[PDB]
Design a protein around this ligand. Structure first.
Ligand SMILES: O=C(NC[C@]1(O)CCCN(c2cc(NCc3ccccc3)ncn2)C1)c1ccc(CN2CC3(CCC3)[C@H]2C2CC2)cc1
Lengths: 242, 197
């Protein structure tokens, strides 16, 4: 069965036919136990001195609002590349960068190198269209774009690299919550920053910073207190120390 | 000459200038991530002579995700798409040390001003069962045929199963030289009168 031909015939994307898309649940409970309280801060990141965010982060999730997310203030790759991400990352730390499906797959790699990371994984959010079998192409597009990439980068010394969900409604810019499961299951550390998160993405174990947040509770010293000894070096996948 | 053609050869040393221009180039190179080419050999490959206007399909993995972008740009292309192949078994279920790999990547580069192509007919995800080791899915040829039907195409580092109508396949495990396009046959005799490379 040629699913590319089938899509040409019927409009059903090939991913629509992937099927199924022991007990890694203790890990989840341990993640839940070590999670810091959610913390969040409304900040216009273009105007905001990023150094005010301390301590240095083990994990940075970065989700700038690309113009392409609005098909029917957007950030260009120009804006994104001038963010001083290297100033707030811990010397051994990780980044996950939503790059969309266009020029971001190239420019996002430029950003990762600019900030001192190398790419170790390319995670694809593959969007099914089971509930609506046409797309308006980017002029440069050769094919219909049915996925987005989240690049994982590393600086310093269970899951697959695919997320399959149905394509959200026109103008819903939300990314699949599964990216958080993937990140947390890596057990990379507990200082976790989500830049350009929203009210709807706030989450235990995470600091969320974005312009559309309606409330803040971020305090630098309160936030640092969660990682003071004996907790400074936890993976976020172990028991809290008694 | 529509039926399959091929040239057993070492793509490093073959003079590709004898082959003319192609609407589509596809390459599945042995990146140095077993017959490997170094990064410099990959950079120096004479891809630029093979097209004036058309598309490049470049399979990449590991660090070649970045190095293939480099070659692509150096060879004169702009990456305008990236196909991923989701590897499944016979039951349509899914088959890099941080995550398990469910997919292979194929960059799509444009050069010049291609016209008469049917952009938008296929989408950028392939779902297809794994045949053999290092075998790419046959679906890519259907997508390439619908994008640019009837045009002449060339594959670098192909294997015997990869030969296809409208395609010329170069690879060092093909069985000899099989050429039918008369313009190519002429330039081949002229450049290679004793039939050796
Ligand atoms: O086996 C291979 N492909 C035929 C050769 O023919 C064999 C032998 C060397 N190779 C050459 C090499 C050559 N010159 C250098 C030389 C000559 C003699 C001795 C040593 C070195 N000239 C002509 N072919 C290729 C091969 C090896 C790896 C992969 C990877 N894949 C699989 C993948 C999955 C979807 C597709 C993709 C992947 C996304 C990145 C694919 C094919």
């Amino acid at each position: 069965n040629d699913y590319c031909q089938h899509f040409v015939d019927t409009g059903h994307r090939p991913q629509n036919f992937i099927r199924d898309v022991e007990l890694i649940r203790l890990k989840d409970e341990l993640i839940a136990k070590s999670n810091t309280p959610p913390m969040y801060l409304q900040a216009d990141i273009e105007a905001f001195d990023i150094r005010e965010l301390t301590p240095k982060f083990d994990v940075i999730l970065l989700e700038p609002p690309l113009e392409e997310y609005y098909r029917e203030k957007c950030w260009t790759w120009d804006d994104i590349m001038k963010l001083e991400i290297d100033e707030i990352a811990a010397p051994r730390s990780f980044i996950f960068l939503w790059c969309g499906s266009g020029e971001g797959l190239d420019l996002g790699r430029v950003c990762l190198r600019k900030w001192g990371y190398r790419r170790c994984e390319d995670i694809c959010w593959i969007k099914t269209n089971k509930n609506n079998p046409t797309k308006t192409l980017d002029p440069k597009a050769v094919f219909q774009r049915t996925k987005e990439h989240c690049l994982m980068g590393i600086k310093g010394t269970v899951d697959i690299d695919l997320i399959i969900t149905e394509e959200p409604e026109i103008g819903n810019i939300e990314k699949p919550v599964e990216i958080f499961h993937i990140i947390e299951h890596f057990c990379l550390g507990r200082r976790r920053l989500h830049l350009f998160g929203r009210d709807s993405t706030i989450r235990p174990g995470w600091l969320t910073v974005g312009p559309t947040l309606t409330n803040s509770n971020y305090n630098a010293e309160t936030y640092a207190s969660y990682f003071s000894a004996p907790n400074s070096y936890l993976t976020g996948c172990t028991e809290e120390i008694e | 000459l529509f039926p399959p053609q091929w040239i057993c050869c070492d793509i490093r040393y073959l003079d590709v200038s004898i082959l003319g221009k192609f609407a589509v180039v596809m390459a599945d190179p042995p990146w140095d991530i077993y017959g490997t080419l170094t990064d410099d050999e990959m950079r120096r490959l004479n891809i630029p002579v093979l097209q004036d206007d058309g598309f490049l399909f470049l399979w990449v993995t590991g660090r070649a995700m970045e190095l293939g972008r480099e070659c692509l740009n150096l060879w004169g292309y702009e990456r305008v798409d990236e196909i991923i192949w989701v590897k499944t078994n016979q039951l349509q279920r899914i088959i890099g040390h941080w995550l398990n790999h469910g997919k292979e990547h194929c960059l799509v580069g444009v050069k010049g001003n291609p016209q008469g192509f049917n952009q938008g007919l296929d989408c950028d995800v392939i779902v297809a069962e794994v045949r053999s080791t290092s075998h790419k899915p046959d679906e890519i040829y259907g997508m390439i045929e619908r994008l640019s039907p009837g045009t002449r195409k060339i594959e670098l580092f192909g294997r015997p199963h990869n030969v296809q109508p409208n395609w010329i396949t170069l690879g060092n495990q093909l069985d000899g030289i099989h050429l039918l396009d008369p313009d190519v046959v002429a330039r081949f005799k002229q450049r290679y009168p004793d039939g050796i490379i």
